[PDB]
Amino acid sequence: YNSFDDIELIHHSLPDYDLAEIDLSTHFAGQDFDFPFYINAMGKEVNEKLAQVADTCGLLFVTPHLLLATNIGLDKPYQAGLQAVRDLQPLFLQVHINLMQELRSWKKHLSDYAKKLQLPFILKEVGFGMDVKTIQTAIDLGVKTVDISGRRSYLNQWGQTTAQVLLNAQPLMDKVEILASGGIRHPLDIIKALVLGAKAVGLSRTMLELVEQHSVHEVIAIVNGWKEDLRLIMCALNCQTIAELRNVDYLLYGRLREGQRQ
Amino acid sequence: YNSFDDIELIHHSLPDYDLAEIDLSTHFAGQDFDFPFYINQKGKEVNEKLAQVADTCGLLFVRPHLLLATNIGLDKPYQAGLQAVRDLQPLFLQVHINLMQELLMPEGEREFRSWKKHLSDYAKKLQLPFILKEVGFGMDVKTIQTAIDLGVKTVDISGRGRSYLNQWGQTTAQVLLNAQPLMDKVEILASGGIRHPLDIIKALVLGAKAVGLSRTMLELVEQHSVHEVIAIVNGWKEDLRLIMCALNCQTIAELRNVDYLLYGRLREGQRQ
Amino acid sequence: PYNSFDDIELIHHSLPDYDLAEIDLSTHFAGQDFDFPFYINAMQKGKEVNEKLAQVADTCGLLFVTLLLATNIGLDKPYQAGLQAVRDLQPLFLQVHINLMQELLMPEGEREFRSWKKHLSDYAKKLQLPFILKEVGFGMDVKTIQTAIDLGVKTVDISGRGRSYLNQWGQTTAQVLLNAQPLMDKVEILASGGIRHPLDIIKALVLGAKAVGLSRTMLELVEQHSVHEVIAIVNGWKEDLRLIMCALNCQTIAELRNVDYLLYGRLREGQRQ
Amino acid sequence: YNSFDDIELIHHSLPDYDLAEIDLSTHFAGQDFDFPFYINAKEVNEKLAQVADTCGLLFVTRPHLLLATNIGLDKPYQAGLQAVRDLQPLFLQVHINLMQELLMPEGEREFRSWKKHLSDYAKKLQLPFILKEVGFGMDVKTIQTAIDLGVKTVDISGRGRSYLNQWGQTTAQVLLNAQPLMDKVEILASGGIRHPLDIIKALVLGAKAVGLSRTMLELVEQHSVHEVIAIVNGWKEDLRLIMCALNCQTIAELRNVDYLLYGRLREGQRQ
Questions:
Q1: How many domains does chain A divide into?
Q2: With contacts defined as CB-CB under 8 Å, which chain C residues touch D110?
Q3: What's the domain range around D1?
């Protein structure tokens, strides 16, 4: 099951735009980007391979002329993140939470960043789906950008799904920047998350599967082709920019519709 | 999956009409037709066969008695379509939009700014009636509305009957349902995923003036002799009055007051 | 195989008010009191089956059509034929059947239907005995039921569903029962089609049918068991009816109308358009 | 199919509590308990009593053993007053197994007494008592009668010839149905509880406590007593863990947790 499968976008028959005028650019964490998707790193042979495709493809890469941001677990003290930032000069700091993966100081550390840190920073949930309450909390600390990342061992089906968390977070989007990740397989999933209102979409699982299957050159090729697919899809939806996608009509089916129809 | 399978017609137990008084005629593209369904590089053989059944069975087809219409892509200039009309003197012109088909085609159209221009020229300059036809993905309401605004009188809403995109578009029933608010502003024609006369009746109930068949017709000629296909087809005209008798409807138009129920995905998509 | 009764759940009642033996199974329709709320509808041989069916009805104390006896006639027959049936047999009532789709899907099936309404009008106008208008297999719609009401018909059997592409034409028994509820004060409703067991029977009764007729189920029974065993199974069904009714806390057939139920799936979908 | 699987709890990414702050205590039938789940019960009862005593759990049929005793409502008030006298339990549980008895060829056939018997307890018994359904789900009407009869605690025990063996309502469905009565009576949940997440779900739906039976029988059937004790004790940490992820400090606060309903359960709620 992938929640994006429960979403249908309304096709538009009479196109207004040439394929080449389609604008793929977006903005978050105080930065303009050429492309609305990016790469989150994973052994270390993998991450080198990924930094390679990001650089050639001109994509942000979240851990030379490579658009760079750094990640740190919120379990670490604030000084550790401040130092990561000083040493690396990333576009921004991303701090992640994995409650259930873990299952205290976390909110202390979070507090410390929101107030002290001068560079833009992002709070990232790690796959369990970030609930509205937590989104509101972050907003109240003055967090400007969150990665909403959604989906004994009777508990491992825990958490909300990506699409579902994106839908719930919709009322808050005029107050915070939303980033989606988790369960994104291809450019249609990407377009879906954007339609739902994410500023951009982080890729993880898919990228690793690609490098495990394809050489870096092949992946670079695949990823650049994905750029085309994005334009193609948006042409078909009659949208000339990334922002216009937020006006695309869509339909919910199955569990996703159920979840929104209580 | 076919979306018509998610529609249930309410049958009527005590009939008022005999099987032989049921009226099958309809009207669109400025023409009267006796029947509410019609037919849409070797290839050229299959089309000889289809034209044959059409002429014989009295169906529109898209032989001086053959009721013919001709098709052209909207990517062509208005002038090309006009040549077509002048050349073949068809009942009407059918202009197709196949955006997604083009986009997925390696050698396909890549620029579309002109499509709207071409469409405008037809609505305002073409004498003969024309139909704007979608090719397979389901014509959305916004497109329909624009057409209406440009002065288009008839549309074929043709819905769904890398590989991650192969389920793009809306289903036929679904597009007919969405289009219902505009059915008094433009003529709706149905096509895509029409298997049999029950699908035909369903499309008409939802409010289409008529229903085009394609795939089903290949399938038939692809496993029967013209003579035998003409048989099934004429017999479909008898399935139509039969179905209609049991729905207690005496004319095509009356089918729009047949009560029905929606189930599953089709109902889901209609109740957001 | 889909059966719409399976889309209905009855709300159990934990704390019983009644003893099992006081549960009353008696009902009333077409001007007759009957001991039980289910009856049998008959099938060239053929005759052999109907012999067996009549023997279980007689022994089990059940109404049998066509001993508690009623007669059936196709509505394509002229009224006088129905009249002579009543005169000759002295049945409890006359059941007149319509089978439109069945006639349509049949080569020889009489394709002229103009006379059915005429004949129905004739029976309403001339026939003293109560008579039932009975759909055959496809579900009687609210429009037909209302027309019956207008003609003076007091009882209908709404008999729902329980080339090939028309093989699933028509409404399911449960669905037709639900559609008919708003008319249940103006006409008596009988259910048939797709009744497999006493729980199906209870469900139909809850939905508001006065009684339910069995057809295919009876045929299946005599095909698998001796007549003795069928009699045993059927009398056992009586106890099942009381048992279920006890569990629901309903002491009479009429009280089943007050039983809470939930709808699921297609059946629920059918009521949430 | 288990009805709890149609319920999704809305979790909380950044908590407010540690696992040590989580209060697991509850109260019903006049008694404080340190834990919100308990055991419903011969050689197997032998073992189950040893797990309960050692784990500090209520045990409904060892001076430290928190004991309660069960009796069928088909018994006259005399037999139940005896039970209390003989065993000095924390409370008496009176069960109603209507459908079970109807499907028993030797089972009860008269029932008019049951409501009489219930009212006697309601009038003659000093010791608190619980009215317990056995497996088929206690319906709103029956609960309302208990209320009017003065009964203060019920176990709503839900689902979780053969055409009848899906009779009754599921545990979660009966919980949902009973909600409007949760300020008028104590609701105990049982029937198809597999693990601590089912426990939490029942508590969130508003039960004061969750009773286990089948699972317990399986555990002492697929394990040794000591293991079972380790198993149940581990369940206690799971409860705090879930409650932390849900950001709840007490059992009570569970009723403010947000949830979504799917499938059959949602369908039953939208008629």
A1: 1
A2: 19-21
A3: 1-271
